Design an enzyme around this catalytic site. Structure first.
Site, PDB file in Angstrom:
ATOM      1  N   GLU A  14       6.515  -1.428   4.830  1.00  0.00           N
ATOM      2  CA  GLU A  14       5.477  -0.964   5.762  1.00  0.00           C
ATOM      3  C   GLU A  14       6.011   0.389   6.298  1.00  0.00           C
ATOM      4  OE1 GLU A  14       4.256  -3.983   8.827  1.00  0.00           O
ATOM      5  OE2 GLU A  14       4.504  -2.220  10.158  1.00  0.00           O
ATOM      6  N   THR A  16       2.540   3.241   7.163  1.00  0.00           N
ATOM      7  CA  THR A  16       1.614   3.925   8.074  1.00  0.00           C
ATOM      8  C   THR A  16       0.169   3.477   7.825  1.00  0.00           C
ATOM      9  OG1 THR A  16       3.064   5.902   8.037  1.00  0.00           O
ATOM     10  CG2 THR A  16       0.868   6.152   9.034  1.00  0.00           C
ATOM     11  N   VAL A  20       3.549  -2.679   1.707  1.00  0.00           N
ATOM     12  CA  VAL A  20       4.060  -2.735   0.328  1.00  0.00           C
ATOM     13  C   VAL A  20       4.523  -4.142  -0.037  1.00  0.00           C
ATOM     14  CG1 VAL A  20       5.548  -1.670  -1.424  1.00  0.00           C
ATOM     15  CG2 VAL A  20       4.738  -0.294   0.499  1.00  0.00           C
ATOM     16  N   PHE A  82       8.554  -1.290  -9.997  1.00  0.00           N
ATOM     17  CA  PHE A  82       9.377  -1.901  -8.951  1.00  0.00           C
ATOM     18  C   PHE A  82      10.816  -1.388  -8.975  1.00  0.00           C
ATOM     19  CE2 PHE A  82      12.297  -5.330  -7.372  1.00  0.00           C
ATOM     20  CZ  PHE A  82      11.875  -5.417  -6.042  1.00  0.00           C
ATOM     21  N   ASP A 127       9.853  14.968   2.663  1.00  0.00           N
ATOM     22  CA  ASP A 127      10.405  13.852   3.453  1.00  0.00           C
ATOM     23  C   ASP A 127      11.533  13.110   2.721  1.00  0.00           C
ATOM     24  OD1 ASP A 127      10.531  12.567   5.945  1.00  0.00           O
ATOM     25  OD2 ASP A 127       9.253  10.936   5.317  1.00  0.00           O
TER      26      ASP A 127
HETATM   27  N1  LIG Z   1      10.205  -1.383   1.798  1.00  0.00           N
HETATM   28  C1  LIG Z   1       9.393  -0.339   1.473  1.00  0.00           C
HETATM   29  N2  LIG Z   1       8.786   0.375   2.456  1.00  0.00           N
HETATM   30  C2  LIG Z   1       7.984   1.408   2.155  1.00  0.00           C
HETATM   31  C3  LIG Z   1       7.781   1.746   0.822  1.00  0.00           C
HETATM   32  C4  LIG Z   1       8.412   1.011  -0.174  1.00  0.00           C
HETATM   33  C5  LIG Z   1       8.217   1.373  -1.606  1.00  0.00           C
HETATM   34  C6  LIG Z   1       7.424   2.523  -2.115  1.00  0.00           C
HETATM   35  C7  LIG Z   1       6.595   3.637  -1.583  1.00  0.00           C
HETATM   36  O1  LIG Z   1       6.377   3.842  -0.251  1.00  0.00           O
HETATM   37  C8  LIG Z   1       6.031   4.494  -2.514  1.00  0.00           C
HETATM   38  C9  LIG Z   1       6.263   4.291  -3.883  1.00  0.00           C
HETATM   39  N3  LIG Z   1       7.005   3.290  -4.405  1.00  0.00           N
HETATM   40  C10 LIG Z   1       7.600   2.388  -3.578  1.00  0.00           C
HETATM   41  N4  LIG Z   1       8.372   1.347  -3.947  1.00  0.00           N
HETATM   42  C11 LIG Z   1       8.733   0.944  -5.182  1.00  0.00           C
HETATM   43  N5  LIG Z   1       8.322   1.602  -6.290  1.00  0.00           N
HETATM   44  N6  LIG Z   1       9.528  -0.147  -5.319  1.00  0.00           N
HETATM   45  C12 LIG Z   1       9.955  -0.829  -4.242  1.00  0.00           C
HETATM   46  C13 LIG Z   1       9.592  -0.412  -2.964  1.00  0.00           C
HETATM   47  C14 LIG Z   1       8.774   0.703  -2.832  1.00  0.00           C
HETATM   48  N7  LIG Z   1       9.210  -0.019   0.167  1.00  0.00           N
END
Ligand SMILES: Nc1nccc(-c2c3c(O)ccnc3n3c(N)nccc23)n1
Ligand SMILES: [Mg+2]
EC number: 2.7.11.22
Lengths: 298, 262
Positions: A14, A16, A20, A82, A127
């Site tokens: 999380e 905004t 996720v 992932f 960022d």
């Molecule tokens: N815990 C968390 N908070 C915000 C964003 C994400 C995030 C994410 C994100 O904010 C944007 C793109 N990919 C993301 N992602 C992937 N590919 N694998 C695991 C997590 C993750 N994971």
């Protein structure tokens, strides 16, 4: 896609404009991250519009892959490959060992590759902080979260001043320069380099002025010699304390000569002289780079 | 300096040259639109110029909107009474992509003189995103122009503003400008502006960059020169009014050259 073929596993973050989840494709087995973007009264958020459109073009091993967009009336799902965790959590988990140098070196090299690819495709990330840098079990590290990114023109125009999480924010943003460019992302990666080595933030300010003074106390207060034009910048004040520049081996004590050289070039005050991601790849620091698996279970 | 991204400029230009072909509208789409014409499109694009002025939007945003409209109309038949809805959603999408402070959606509903409701605008936004597959980061005439400007010896504000004005005029007339890629229109616009103001020509350094010469640019230049000559008489006048402004160095008051001697 999709949706009916995805089996949600757990909430992983999380958020905004949303949440996720870790999920799996029931038919192919593929594990994914599903980023849910809540819809509505301004329609599709501009941050989601940028993240999706910008990531459509950015296919690279060190940029998180956008696999699909599931686009409906009240929900928008971004389906990403992932990745197992973020660099910040990896650094915390490495608290007592530290991160082995070959891994730090591998990760920096990959980040520079991913970033140079962004910049070669006219995208500023804006960022880069350890939370947005995701790692897998095979030794990859990737740039994630392009919600704050921007397609730029050449030469750049004025873009949003807000930019970059404070601790990783470049002095030319803090000093209110009309223009900022690719150098802002390199500044962030220099802060991340130091942080991988120490496992603590290089410049942890609590305000813009506090951030600036912390930088000045480490790197010296910049003058016209080190940074032509600095004294004419909007938020430069003649009253700024004039701190002496530290011996650079004292900034990150366990860093070798080649490491310190590269760090110093990433943290150059003058955005015109700061090293580019493309040039940094050829730095002697990387002469012996390999890509090992992380030393800890993810 | 870094603002001109010396380490990436060439990669970016190459990338944009690839993307412009991929993002190009279909040249013959108006022929396949039963209910809309080049003339109705001209009215729309001229209205979008006014909107961009009213809300002080970037010229880039206007260019993007037009690209989105032309691409949308390359695959979707639209009735005349819905053309402005497509146009408005396109300008909303372009603003969100490109602006620091995009106008609120209510502001977009307001400028359509309440022809459409907020719900329609937002539903059209969704539809445009679907049709375009979120592929919003398109190259524009302006993105090539600003790179070409770096080759002036020395930089000249009238040359820059005039080239922009000319590229903007091409947005109005799908015949013939749908034929030409952004990089080519920008190249003809830059040469024509340079020639009008300084008497100079498309420089060798830009032949080196682009592979374009005066001969490859001839067809577009001949079109653009005629457009420039006929501009005071065109039914659409918003760009000319816009470019009388000091902001753009009053370049629409400059006289076109009578011949190109090409
Ligand atoms: N815990 C968390 N908070 C915000 C964003 C994400 C995030 C994410 C994100 O904010 C944007 C793109 N990919 C993301 N992602 C992937 N590919 N694998 C695991 C997590 C993750 N994971
Ligand atoms: Mg027709």
């Amino acid at each position: 896609g999709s949706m009916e073929n995805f089996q949600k596993v757990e909430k992983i973050g999380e958020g905004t404009y949303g949440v996720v989840y870790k999920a799996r494709n029931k038919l192919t087995g593929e594990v994914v991250a599903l980023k849910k973007i809540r819809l509505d009264t301004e329609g599709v958020p501009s941050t989601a519009i940028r993240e999706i459109s910008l990531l459509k073009e950015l296919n690279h091993p060190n940029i998180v892959k956008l696999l699909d967009v599931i686009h409906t009336e009240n929900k928008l799902y971004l389906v990403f490959e992932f990745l197992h965790q973020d660099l910040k959590k990896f650094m915390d988990a490495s608290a007592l060992t530290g991160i082995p140098l070959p891994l730090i070196k591998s990760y920096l090299f990959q980040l520079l590759q991913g970033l140079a690819f962004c910049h070669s495709h006219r995208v500023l990330h804006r960022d880069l902080k350890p939370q947005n840098l995701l790692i897998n079990t095979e030794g990859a590290i990737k740039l994630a979260d392009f919600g704050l990114a921007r397609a730029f023109g050449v030469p750049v125009r004025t873009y949003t001043h807000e930019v970059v999480t404070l601790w990783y924010r470049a002095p030319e943003i803090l000093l209110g320069c009309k223009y900022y460019s690719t150098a802002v992302d390199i500044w962030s990666l220099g802060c991340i380099f130091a942080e991988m080595v120490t496992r603590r933030a290089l410049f942890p300010g609590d305000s813009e002025i506090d951030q600036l003074f912390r930088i000045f106390r480490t790197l010296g207060t910049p003058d016209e010699v080190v940074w032509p034009g600095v004294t004419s910048m909007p938020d430069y004040k003649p009253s700024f304390p004039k701190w002496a520049r530290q011996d650079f081996s004292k900034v990150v004590p366990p860093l070798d000569e080649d490491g310190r050289s590269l760090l110093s070039q990433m943290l150059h005050y003058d955005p015109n002289k700061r090293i580019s991601a493309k040039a940094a790849l050829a730095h002697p620091f990387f002469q012996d780079v390999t890509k090992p698996v992380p030393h800890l279970r993810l | 300096s870094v603002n001109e991204v010396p380490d990436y400029h060439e990669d970016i230009h190459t990338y944009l040259r690839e993307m412009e072909v991929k993002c190009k509208p279909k040249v013959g789409y108006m022929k396949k639109q039963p209910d809309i014409t080049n003339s109705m499109r001209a009215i729309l694009v001229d209205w979008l110029v006014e909107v961009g002025e009213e809300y002080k939007l970037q010229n880039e945003t206007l260019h993007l909107a037009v690209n989105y409209i032309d691409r949308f109309l390359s695959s979707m038949s639209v009735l005349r009474g819905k053309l402005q809805l497509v146009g408005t959603a396109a300008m909303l999408l372009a603003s969100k992509f490109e602006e620091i402070y995009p106008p609120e959606v209510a502001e977009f509903v307001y400028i359509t003189d309440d022809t459409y409701t907020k719900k329609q605008v937002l539903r059209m936004e969704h539809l445009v995103l679907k049709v375009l597959a979120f592929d919003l980061a398109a190259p524009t005439i302006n993105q090539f122009l600003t790179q070409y400007f770096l080759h002036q010896q020395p930089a000249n504000c009238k040359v820059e503003s005039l080239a922009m004005f000319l590229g903007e005029l091409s947005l109005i007339d799908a015949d013939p400008y749908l034929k030409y890629l952004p990089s080519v229109i920008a190249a003809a616009a830059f040469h024509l502006a340079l020639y009008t103001v300084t008497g100079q020509s498309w420089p060798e350094s830009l032949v080196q960059k682009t592979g374009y010469t005066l001969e490859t640019l001839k067809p577009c230049l001949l079109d653009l020169h005629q457009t420039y000559l006929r501009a005071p008489q065109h039914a659409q006048q918003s760009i000319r009014e816009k470019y009388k402004n000091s902001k753009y160095h009053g370049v629409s008051l400059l006289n076109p050259p009578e011949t190109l001697n090409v």
